[PDB]
Design a protein around this ligand. Structure first.
Ligand SMILES: *[C@@H]1O[C@H](CO)[C@@H](O)[C@H](O)[C@H]1NC(C)=O
Lengths: 212, 204, 194
């Protein structure tokens, strides 16, 4: 009635397997008043099902819903590669309509290893007060990353906690990055700045390290 | 048929009001109510209010009762929205919906959304940094407030591996992004709002 | 001393059919002959009482029901009628005593492009009782499947806009109607005549 939570959150599924999204109620919505949407990245939400059982006009037969009083489920059989977006829940059993969180259906591809690169500053970057050291990972399937640093005493984040976002591609791969921010002459004065990431099978990646 | 066309983005100052429009077309305007729903970056949807054109009555939420003023012009078929005393955490994509004239409803027709930013600052040009790596190389556009920025590579020469990283809002209110592609590599940056067509040369 | 009639005939803003404004006017002197010879109306049907000899009678307490309808629905404002206004919007009793006054108001109640300020109840569950005001706005349960709040199908919105366009026919124009109820009883009367 007031809060809606999705169980999967980020459901990785193969292009063709059936999906099962969950959205449990909070105060026992009486007349199955729940609606599902499809909010594509950078677009408007698409209305799919009203009343949790009847689909809208133009919706294919692949989408189907269930649930009676406190737990409604969305069934997407034979998931096509086009239905890769966020799916929100919306209830209208009470006066104020409340939404949910959304399940990001992502592509399921083979696990790959990332590539570590280091971008040391230059003559125009050292004598500028904005010395940035960028460490990025490319072509990796597990988007969850634990990119770490070794700034002169320990796993010190400091200015390396930028945590630049990423997104998928045609080959179902992600590529994030992380930039730094230093002082006028605190780069070459300190020790070597390393970069690692706790990857699924590459927890200790050492490649292309630049000393000062 | 039914096209709820909204306006564009609005670069607004903190502590002010905004006025977005929703051009309702297709069917009649009085036979359908209109509701506005915002979407914060990464967060969910929030139902702000709903106007009934045939009754000229509005119903706001508990956190918007006394701050939101939504009108409805029954002549040009346009729905308006006004927020008084905007704060810094109101940067969200405001969508226009066409709900039915009932106590309970669903948001079947949507619009296009407006990325109205409320935490603004001074406008700056793209300050590209020549990142020299230890050939994986990129260009880090730094210190620019306006979101729309086209970080290309020699008039779009490289079209393979040019991953435009999404920008992240820094503490100085000037978000920055990078574009690293492994292949003269003069990454041309085109700033659309301001006039600064900097083409910084970056070589490893 | 004179009874105020400039707020029910010369009112700048009238009300809708389902939300007609009832005004009680008593303890006054009210002359009704200045409205007949004014020749500024269209219908002056006096039910029960006569159009004349009304300035020589003292009434107990009279009312003034004002609303705006269309030209094809003026005949429904009469004792013992049927249709849509007399069934769900404004019902008159079979023993109604008084005069029904109506005149064309298209010159000021017809906004260019369709005036959507005047509404009327399209259909309700039961018929309206004489001198009853139903301002409910819930959806009308029709068909068989209960909607339970939503509009959907088989549940339509009761209110409907007239859409008074300036370029309409003689039957699709606004007509402001003023209904006076000359309530007579054996009790001491207050609204006397000159
Ligand atoms: C309305 O105003 C006109 C013009 O002054 C006047 O002749 C008329 O008597 C007024 N109506 C009533 C009911 O007095």
């Amino acid at each position: 009635e007031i809060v809606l939570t999705q169980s999967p959150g980020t459901l990785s599924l193969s292009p063709g397997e059936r999906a099962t999204l969950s959205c449990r109620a909070s105060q026992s919505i009486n007349n199955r008043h729940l609606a599902w949407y499809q909010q594509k990245r950078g677009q408007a939400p698409r209305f799919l099902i009203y009343g949790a059982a009847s689909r809208a006009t133009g919706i294919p037969d692949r989408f189907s819903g269930s649930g009676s009083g406190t737990d409604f489920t969305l069934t997407i059989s034979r998931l096509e590669p086009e239905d890769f977006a966020v799916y929100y829940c919306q209830q209208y059993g009470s006066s104020p309509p409340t939404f949910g969180q959304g399940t990001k259906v992502e592509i399921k591809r083979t696990v790959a290893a990332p590539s570590v690169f280091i971008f040391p500053p230059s003559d125009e970057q050292l004598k500028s007060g904005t010395a940035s050291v960028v460490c990025l990972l490319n072509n990796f399937y597990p988007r969850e990353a634990k990119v770490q640093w070794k700034v002169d005493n320990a796993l010190q984040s400091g200015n390396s906690q930028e945590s630049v976002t990423e997104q998928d591609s045609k080959d179902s791969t992600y590529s994030l990055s992380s930039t730094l921010t230093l002082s006028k002459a605190d780069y070459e004065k300190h020790k070597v700045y390393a970069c690692e990431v706790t990857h699924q099978g590459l927890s200790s990646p050492v490649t292309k390290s630049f000393n000062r | 048929q039914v096209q709820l066309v909204q306006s564009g983005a609005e670069v607004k100052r903190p502590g002010s009001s905004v006025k977005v429009s929703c051009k309702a077309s297709g069917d009649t305007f009085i036979n359908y109510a209109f509701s506005w729903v915002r979407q914060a970056p990464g967060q969910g949807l929030e139902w702000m209010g709903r106007i009934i054109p045939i009754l000229d009555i509005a119903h706001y939420a508990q956190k918007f009762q006394g701050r939101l003023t939504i009108t409805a012009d029954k002549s040009t078929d346009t729905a308006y929205m006004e927020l008084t005393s905007l704060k810094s955490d109101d940067t969200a994509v405001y969508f226009c919906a066409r709900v039915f004239r009932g106590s309970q409803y669903w948001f079947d027709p949507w619009g296009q959304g407006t990325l109205v930013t409320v935490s603004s600052a001074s406008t700056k040009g793209p300050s590209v940094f020549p990142l020299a790596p230890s050939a994986a190389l990129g260009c880090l556009v730094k210190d620019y407030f306006p979101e729309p920025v086209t970080v290309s590579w020699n008039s779009g020469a490289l079209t393979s591996g040019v991953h435009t990283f999404p920008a992240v809002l820094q503490s100085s209110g000037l978000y920055s992004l990078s574009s690293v592609v492994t292949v003269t590599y003069i990454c041309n940056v085109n700033h659309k709002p301001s006039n600064t067509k900097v083409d910084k040369r970056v070589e490893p | 001393n004179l009874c105020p009639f400039g707020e029910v005939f010369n009112a700048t803003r009238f009300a809708s059919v389902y939300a007609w404004n009832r005004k009680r006017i008593s303890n006054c002197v009210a002359d009704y002959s200045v409205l007949y010879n004014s020749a500024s109306f269209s219908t002056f049907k006096c039910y029960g009482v006569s159009p004349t000899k009304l300035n020589d009678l003292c009434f107990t307490n009279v009312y003034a029901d004002s609303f705006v309808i269309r030209g094809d629905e003026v005949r429904q404002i009469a004792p013992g009628q049927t249709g849509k206004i007399a069934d769900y919007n404004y019902k008159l009793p079979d023993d109604f005593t008084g005069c029904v006054i109506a005149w064309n108001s298209n010159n000021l109640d017809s906004k260019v492009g369709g005036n959507y300020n005047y509404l009327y109840r399209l259909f309700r569950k039961s018929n309206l009782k004489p001198f009853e005001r139903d301002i409910s706005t819930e959806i009308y349960q029709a068909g068989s499947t209960p909607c339970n709040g939503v509009e959907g199908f088989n549940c339509y919105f009761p209110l409907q806009s007239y859409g008074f366009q300036p370029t309409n026919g003689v039957g699709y124009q606004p007509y402001r109607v003023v209904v006076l109820s000359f309530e007579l009883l054996h009790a001491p009367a207050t609204v006397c005549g000159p």
